[model samples]
Target: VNPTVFFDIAVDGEPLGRVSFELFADKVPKTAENFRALSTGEKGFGYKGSCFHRIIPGFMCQGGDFTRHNGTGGKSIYGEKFEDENFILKHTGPGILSMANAGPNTNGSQFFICTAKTEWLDGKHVVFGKVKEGMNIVEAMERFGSRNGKTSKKITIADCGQL
Candidate 1:
């Protein structure tokens, strides 16, 4: 069975809601484990208190940059970065969870959740999970997004953990 994780979200210091995801460990074990461990904070540092630095209305909302929280810095549990596991999964629709990278084989702790069908990212990003709940919260976040990949309000992962 797949493991489930959750993020308690807040916008501009106001509570939004929780977003949960089911990791596709069967298909992307390494990628899934990375998110899971990061959520649990077993490494002493994780997604907690990180902001969703980038949001595009018809594209996606991205976060997981625990280091800088602004799409510039994050580190993988493995090291500074990890190699792409396998692009078996496709970015077919909304609520898809995939790793964000600077280039090929440069995945770190950063990731994004698709708000639309981003088919162009199919083999370029590693899809490891999907939203199991709180799609509404994601939709609500869209209103704060801009085409320039910035958010009007500060969206943060106030807390996160495995469930």
Candidate 2:
């Protein structure tokens, strides 16, 4: 599938960048709906000034914590972690996007993208889409490595849209 949805990321009033996410809506409706809510500026009001605050080289760089940019806060939204095999999208390259969860059913507003081939995370995390562009910025975030070596200084998902 092609991650074709455009997402404009920004912090406060500064423009960050835009990335694409081809949602596997057919595979995981609930998860997709959650993403849609946040992307559409519904669920991420408090999560405005977060970052990719946990980066691992050759692995995943994750962020999006409303309480803490690094992995140092509580979950904003809470629920049981759900998994669907419908999206067997391998996290086998850069731009791979996945939902950040706290075990099973605790997927709130946290998500991450793979900077390398992290095929090991299959089925464990919700592999949603692969980024079509704006990976250079993602790479820059990987350098900070705060949340278990998986974060950057600070980046924000300004807004999101789908086609």
Candidate 3:
């Protein structure tokens, strides 16, 4: 069955509401489980308090680096990194959720939610889910983004858990 998860987002210390995702576990079980476990903090370290360090308007919002709260740190539940589950799911359009990695087999805690169709990332990234709700919240967060992937204000995942 598909699992739903949520992130209670905030910008510069102000509340911005929730963004829920529906993970495609049936298609990408390993990838989806990593996100699910991270959301629940069952492993003791997870997405809470992590900031979206990179957000490029008309592209995607990247985050989940819970270690440094920056783009360069984070580890998977399995270890520092894990193999790419598969590339069965495509980065077809907006709301697509996929792992953010350095290269092949580098999947970790980091992930991105697409704000637009990103065809170029289709095969390179493992697409595992979509924004099941809170598309407007994602849009709202996009307003705080810049062309260079930096944010005008700090956007954070204040809290997160499975739902």
Candidate 4:
């Protein structure tokens, strides 16, 4: 019923199976294509050792940076594309993975996972994927995150195919 992309984060060459993401297309095209390009095993954007370094317990978890360590430095992969509130894929639910941005057009490679049900961001951030499994493990990330006030941890997209 659910298709998943199996990604495991490792520390010291050991495995932690929670770093995987089950991305859903059709919900978000730009964000999904961007992630797909990275997951493609080719090179240059697959971010196999990247970080989801910012997390929020009752809010959200974010990590992805083509540049800045604080998730503030990624180029706009596509022009501004905000959902029109008619999309069923809202950011008001748990386990949702979506893109992060500055304004309506600043989304880059950065992504976030919703640890808490936050309807405040509904139709704002593009919703593309969900935890599908390892959500409780998401809660185990560090309490305090970046200076931007987002709790996060290191992650590499691992790979992206059909899971």
lDDT of each: 0.94, 0.62, 0.93, 0.61
Give per-residue CA lDDT, model 1, range 27-139, as digits (tens): 99988999999999998889889999999999999999888778889998899999999999999899999999999999999999999999989899999999999999999
Clashing pairs in 3: none
Deviation in angstroms for 62 in model 2? Answer: 0.7
Tens-place lDDT per residue, model 3, 15-54, is 9999999999999898999999999999898998889999
Candidate 1 ranges beyond 4 A from true positions: none
lDDT of 4: 0.61
lDDT of 4 by residue, 58-125 (tens): 77767666567667665433432333222368776777887787777556677777877878887676
- TM-score (all chains, Cα) for each model: 0.98, 0.70, 0.98, 0.73
Give the Cα-based TM-score of candidate 3 against the true structure: 0.98
Residue runs of model 3 more than 4 Å from their true location after superposition: none
Candidate 1 lands at a TM-score of: 0.98
Candidate 2 lDDT: 0.62
- In model 4, which runs have C-alpha deviations exceeding 4 angstroms? 1-3, 11-14, 41-43, 76-88, 142-162
Query: Candidate 4 has what TM-score?
Result: 0.73
* Clashing pairs for predicted structure model 4, backbone only: 4-163, 50-155, 51-155, 52-63, 53-152, 53-153, 54-151, 54-152, 55-151, 55-152
lDDT of 2 by residue, 1-163 (tens): 4325666665434775666666666666666665655555464453444455566765776766656665655343334334443446667778877877667655666778888877777777777666667777666555555545733334565556664
